[PDB]
Design a protein around this ligand. Structure first.
Ligand SMILES: [Mg+2]
Ligand SMILES: [Mg+2]
Ligand SMILES: [Mg+2]
Ligand SMILES: [Mg+2]
Ligand SMILES: [Mg+2]
Ligand SMILES: [Mg+2]
Ligand SMILES: [Mg+2]
Ligand SMILES: [Mg+2]
Ligand SMILES: [Mg+2]
Ligand SMILES: [Mg+2]
Ligand SMILES: [Mg+2]
Ligand SMILES: [Mg+2]
Ligand SMILES: [Mg+2]
Ligand SMILES: [Mg+2]
Ligand SMILES: [Mg+2]
Ligand SMILES: [Mg+2]
Ligand SMILES: [Mg+2]
Ligand SMILES: [Mg+2]
Ligand SMILES: [Mg+2]
Ligand SMILES: [Mg+2]
Ligand SMILES: [Mg+2]
Ligand SMILES: [Mg+2]
Ligand SMILES: [Mg+2]
Ligand SMILES: [Mg+2]
Ligand SMILES: [Mg+2]
Lengths: 121, 152, 140, 121, 278, 155
RNA sequence: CGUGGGGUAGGGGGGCGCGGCCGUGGGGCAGAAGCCGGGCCGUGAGGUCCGGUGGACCCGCGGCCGACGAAGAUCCCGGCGG
RNA sequence: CACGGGCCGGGGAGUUCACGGCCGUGGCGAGCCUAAGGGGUUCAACCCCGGAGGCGUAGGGAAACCGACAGCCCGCAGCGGG
RNA sequence: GCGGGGAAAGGAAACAUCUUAGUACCCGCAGGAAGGGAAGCCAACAGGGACCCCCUGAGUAGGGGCGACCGAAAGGGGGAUA
């Protein structure tokens, strides 16, 4: 087949470059692992609905999503989520549940080592 | 979006064009016949890999009858867990009219004809549906609501 | 001509030796047939091709093992880095210690005079002033 | 009446195949500034007996009378713009009407005056 | 709300040129600074050249026409193959007095073209509406940066600032001579002058088919609504496009598929931009 | 603005009780008698009348009443009447030879069935699809390719 | 870093050329394309320059699209040989 | 001692549509897209409208008919502790 | 465009039912279009409302060595409206 080229979006290319630098700078394997998952082919990119965050995460959890966060199900928990991108329904459901939505570069700046961060795919 | 060069660009100079030298590019005899043929004689091994053993059912044979679509109902069920999302969405738009002190939802006006029992109901609500499953009526009851069955 | 560093002087000497001994890459019987005598290299995919199979006593096939050194690859024989120039405004941003000017082949004689005078005063080695331009400036 | 199509093939087709009454409009030449003030019209098709000034070519600067006009070729013959063939006779150079300026007008034709009023008005 | 839009990549990636200003400068018709207006949301879109290229190619591809050959070309001769035994190749040949002459095959003179262009071929590259409008916002934001507009080729050395917005009084200019002053007073005339001397008789067969001249792009003028007098006053300049803001598209915002077009916005058009393409 | 009649889409058994509305053919006679007009007067004013329809809808009546007041108060211009404004009948040559008499119509099947279900219609319709390579005729054997592909992938 | 360096059918990855289009930058009567010979560059497809001939167009770079690459088919058409 | 070509020039072969599978990317995302068609336009481009319909969201059964999860364990990455 | 007469090659990897195809072709007859067109209709107890053409319904129902393959209609959205 046409072998995997990687993303054509430059915003995704820079974020992939950003995470690899943050992994090297901080010796945090979470950023390198997130970079590998973000760089996957478009037909297998990670997507998560907010309903799944009810199960895999509890209140006070800081969650990084290596892809898109979709708005599905109902979120009854307070969680800090960082995503590659968030739909308007997912952002509203996260905020009104008491959580807060972060960009991935913002989470690295706030938490350089990524200690206690839970990856959700 | 990414663009790729055609295989014909690569095949100029290759004599056989990817078809081989021994088994070259021939007419429909190179396929085993024209169209979807040979599945009982020489492509029977393909039926034995996908269809049922012995009969080769989905490729060949009859099974049952079809109830006519002009006298049967097209069903548009919705689970109560999904129905919980819809009432919240309608509640914020001011569409739902509060009449008995609970919220009242008319399934037919929404476009659904049946109520199913998947998910959770967390609010008291009145649902008009010509058909509601057993677990669906229970879960609406547990949330304080009721199901009213309306005949067509 | 162009003063290269010592690592780039040996490679340029070595690249000259590789150019001297490089085989000319021709198809089989190219010397025999007038219909293909002026053609480029063709790696013909045939049953009895003895050049692809590298038989001793036959012509040689094209391979990446014949590649010249990467540092001096593509340089003019004087060592400079050739730059095609089509007008005097094209002379901006050129280092005379690094770049040798090659005037465009279709540049007119009227412009070639105006190019060569500016290029010469900047110190650039102009490869191809032309016979007409050389005679005029010689006469001045 | 000359194609309004922008395609060059249709423009060239109408010009070559134009009938005689349409080729008269290709004989138009610029009047001199004196004649423009004397007539008020900026152009007139060149007529036999008009005095013209050649404005381009080898005979640029020569002024003479128009001895002949050709509708088919759209060329004009002017005295002075001549030469001699190998046998010694004197022959005329065919000048396109757009390369001359009418410095004197032949207005003895009553039909020409009516065309003068049409363009000044 | 735009945190995912303009992604902050510090400190492990150095930031690039700053975003468009929070307020857009406004100049009078005499070229002097008069007031300031808030930047619409369209100018905060990140410049995405690949999306711009895709959306441009879709718009360009929908204008092409279906081409073909005659359905019977090379196929209407009375010909037939005469088999073996005559010492000649077994391609079809003429049946009559021209008998040995080959016919109908692709390798024969006068034969049919083997795989000719087909009029039913799909030349249009379809694009989703939301995707196409996202690219239009992206190409709009590319006009806010001096880097992109200088990259596309325009001369912006005399341009006081980008995005270049002028007052809404410019819509009453009805003459080309009056409009030429406003371009000169706003530092736009050098780029219009660039397109004038850049017109060239293009190489190849396009001269035969009505494409003799190749003319660069100079300035896109955005007016508030259709039929303003400024449209007829600027449309004659070489390379200048003039469209109402509701008629914006990728063919004027990214010529050649590359973002960044020297654009003169009127102040009223900027106000009307807040409810379009989003 | 001329009002447009609003009728009910016929509720099918397959629908399961889901209903919607549509622009009907014209205002019913029952709806017109509640505003004082018959079919001739309504068509003269320019309304589209459907004498076949029997139902009456109050939304149809209100739109008639509001529009009728504007017309009769000189605040609105009515359209041209909904009646035939031209009579073009061509001379018929060779009716017997083109099968247009009663015997030819009976032989073609127009007496006993509809034009769409007649056999000459079916011949012409399938020929136009194949000539233009239309919806299902762009691929021959499309049903059998689909059936075998569904087995192989949904096995 | 590799007790890495053969390769038909075939699978995968990159590049050169031809005609047009969207852009950008240029050249040309002080001589464009084409043609003959030659130097230089590139493993190579090829590029580029010089001298002669010619007389009006053409080319570099980014993107896109094809009626897109011949040594052969008792290949087709023409021309011309022993 | 298997068959094809005397030579040279020019020509000469994986195309398009429909449907299906899959891949590489892009948009949106429990939703996605409009088709025909309609208005405007600097007029086949372009902007706007058009959600009919199609696919997805629920399956089982010939059919009548019925109609669905966070409980536990192992455990890669990742994280925290030594 | 309308009425009638009416194949085979090929496909089914043979072939006869079948398909190709009511096609090629033939005979007859009109117009600038033709034909169709105004409920002994469709529906399902709720309602549409002459006709033609476009999108769809849909390769669904169904036909068929139940093989190859063939294949609607109602309904919905439009053009136009008498
Ligand atoms: Mg094979
Ligand atoms: Mg074999
Ligand atoms: Mg073969
Ligand atoms: Mg069998
Ligand atoms: Mg049975
Ligand atoms: Mg061998
Ligand atoms: Mg030359
Ligand atoms: Mg021909
Ligand atoms: Mg394409
Ligand atoms: Mg050429
Ligand atoms: Mg069919
Ligand atoms: Mg090898
Ligand atoms: Mg290029
Ligand atoms: Mg060969
Ligand atoms: Mg011959
Ligand atoms: Mg002889
Ligand atoms: Mg043989
Ligand atoms: Mg021989
Ligand atoms: Mg056939
Ligand atoms: Mg057969
Ligand atoms: Mg047979
Ligand atoms: Mg007759
Ligand atoms: Mg008619
Ligand atoms: Mg009639
Ligand atoms: Mg049939």
């Amino acid at each position: 087949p046409p072998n995997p080229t990687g993303p054509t979006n430059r915003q995704l290319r820079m974020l992939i470059r950003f995470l690899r630098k943050a992994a090297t700078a901080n010796s945090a394997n979470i950023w390198r692992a997130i970079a590998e998952l973000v760089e996957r082919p478009r037909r297998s990119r990670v997507v998560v609905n907010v309903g799944k965050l009810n199960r895999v995460a509890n209140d006070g959890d800081v969650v990084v999503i290596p892809g898109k966060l979709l708005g599905g199900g109902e979120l009854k928990k307070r969680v800090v989520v960082a995503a590659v991108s968030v739909t308007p329904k997912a952002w509203k459901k996260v905020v009104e549940a008491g959580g807060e939505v972060l960009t991935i570069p913002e989470l690295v700046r706030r938490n350089p080592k990524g200690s206690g961060v839970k990856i959700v795919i | 979006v990414r663009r790729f060069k055609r295989a014909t660009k690569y095949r100029r100079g290759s004599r056989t064009h990817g078809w081989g030298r021994v088994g070259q590019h021939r007419k429909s005899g190179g396929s085993g016949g024209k169209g979807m043929v040979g599945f009982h004689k020489h492509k029977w091994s393909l039926v034995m890999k996908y269809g049922e053993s012995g009969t080769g059912w989905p490729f060949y044979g009859k099974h049952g009858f079809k109830q006519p679509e002009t006298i049967s109902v097209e069903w548009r069920p919705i689970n109560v867990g999904r129905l919980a999302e819809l009432v919240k969405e309608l509640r914020e738009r001011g569409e739902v009219r509060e009449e008995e002190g609970r919220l009242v939802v008319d399934l037919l006006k929404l476009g659904y004809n049946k109520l199913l029992g998947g998910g959770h109901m967390d609010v008291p609500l009145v649902v008009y549906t010509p058909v509601a499953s057993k677990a669906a009526v229970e879960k609406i009851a547990k949330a304080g609501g009721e199901v009213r069955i309306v005949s067509l | 001509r162009r003063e290269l560093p010592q690592p780039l002087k040996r490679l340029l000497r070595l690249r000259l030796q590789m150019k001297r001994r490089k085989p000319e890459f021709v198809r089989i019987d190219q010397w025999r047939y007038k219909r293909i005598e002026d053609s480029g290299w063709r790696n013909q995919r045939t049953l009895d091709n003895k050049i692809r199979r590298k038989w001793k006593g036959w012509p040689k096939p094209v391979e990446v093992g014949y590649r010249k050194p990467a540092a001096v690859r593509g340089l003019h024989p004087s060592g400079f880095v050739e730059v095609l120039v089509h007008r005097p405004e094209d002379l901006a941003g050129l280092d005379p210690k690094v770049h040798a000017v090659r005037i465009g082949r279709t540049v007119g004689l009227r412009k070639r005079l105006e190019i060569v005078k500016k290029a010469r005063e900047l110190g650039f080695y102009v490869l191809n002033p032309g016979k007409e331009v050389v005679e005029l400036l010689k006469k001045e | 009446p000359f194609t309004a199509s922008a395609q060059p093939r249709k423009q060239r087709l109408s010009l070559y195949a134009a009938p005689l009454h349409l080729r008269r409009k290709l004989l138009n030449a610029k009047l001199s500034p004196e004649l423009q003030k004397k007539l008020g019209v900026k152009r007139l098709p060149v007529r036999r007996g008009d005095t013209v000034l050649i404005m381009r070519g080898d005979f640029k600067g020569v002024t003479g009378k128009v001895v002949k006009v050709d509708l088919k070729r759209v060329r004009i013959f002017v005295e002075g713009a001549t030469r001699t063939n190998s046998r010694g006779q004197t022959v005329y150079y065919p000048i396109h009407p757009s390369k001359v300026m009418i410095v004197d007008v032949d207005l003895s034709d009553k039909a020409r005056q009516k065309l003068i009023e049409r363009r000044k008005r | 709300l735009l945190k995912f839009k303009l992604l902050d990549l510090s400190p492990y990636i150095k930031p690039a040129e700053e975003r468009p200003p929070e307020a857009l400068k406004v100049y009078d018709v005499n070229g002097q600074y008069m007031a300031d207006i808030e930047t619409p949301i369209h100018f905060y879109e990140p410049v995405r050249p690949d999306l711009i290229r895709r959306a441009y190619l879709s718009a360009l591809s929908a204008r092409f026409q279906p081409k073909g050959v005659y359905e019977g070309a090379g196929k209407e001769h009375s010909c037939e193959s005469f088999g073996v035994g005559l010492g000649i190749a077994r391609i079809p040949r003429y049946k009559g007095h021209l008998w040995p002459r080959g016919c109908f095959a692709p390798n024969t003179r006068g034969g049919r073209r083997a795989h000719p262009p087909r009029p039913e071929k799909k030349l249009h590259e379809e694009i989703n509406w939301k995707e196409k409008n996202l690219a239009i916002r992206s190409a709009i934001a590319a006009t806010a940066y001096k880097s992109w507009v200088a990259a596309r080729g325009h001369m912006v050395e005399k341009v006081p600032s980008l995005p270049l917005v002028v007052s809404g009084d410019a819509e009453k200019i009805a003459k080309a001579k009056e409009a030429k002053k406003l371009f000169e007073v706003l530092g736009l005339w050098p780029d219009v002058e660039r397109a004038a001397e850049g017109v060239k008789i293009r190489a190849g067969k396009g001269k035969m088919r009505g494409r003799r001249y190749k003319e660069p792009k100079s300035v896109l003028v955005v007016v508030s609504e259709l039929d303003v007098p400024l449209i007829g006053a600027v449309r004659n300049f070489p390379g200048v496009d003039v469209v109402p803001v509701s008629h914006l598209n990728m063919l004027v915002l990214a010529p050649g598929g590359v973002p960044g077009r020297l654009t003169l916005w009127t102040a009223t058009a900027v106000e009307r931009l807040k409810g379009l393409f989003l | 603005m001329i009002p447009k009649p609003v009728v009910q889409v016929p509720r099918s058994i397959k629908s399961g009780g889901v209903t919607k509305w549509k622009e009907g053919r014209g205002f019913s006679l029952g709806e017109l008698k509640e505003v004082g007009l018959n079919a001739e007067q309504a068509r003269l004013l320019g309304l589209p009348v459907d004498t076949r329809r029997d139902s009456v809808w109050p939304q149809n009546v209100e739109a008639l009443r509001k529009w009728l007041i504007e017309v009769l108060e000189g605040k609105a211009t009515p359209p041209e009447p909904t009646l035939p404004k031209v009579v073009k009948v061509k001379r018929k040559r060779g009716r017997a030879f083109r099968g247009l008499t009663s015997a030819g119509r009976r032989s073609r099947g127009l007496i006993s069935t509809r034009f769409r279900e007649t056999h000459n219609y079916k011949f012409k319709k399938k020929a136009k699809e194949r000539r233009l390579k239309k919806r299902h005729e762009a691929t021959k054997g499309l049903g059998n390719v689909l059936r075998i592909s569904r087995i192989i992938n949904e096995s």
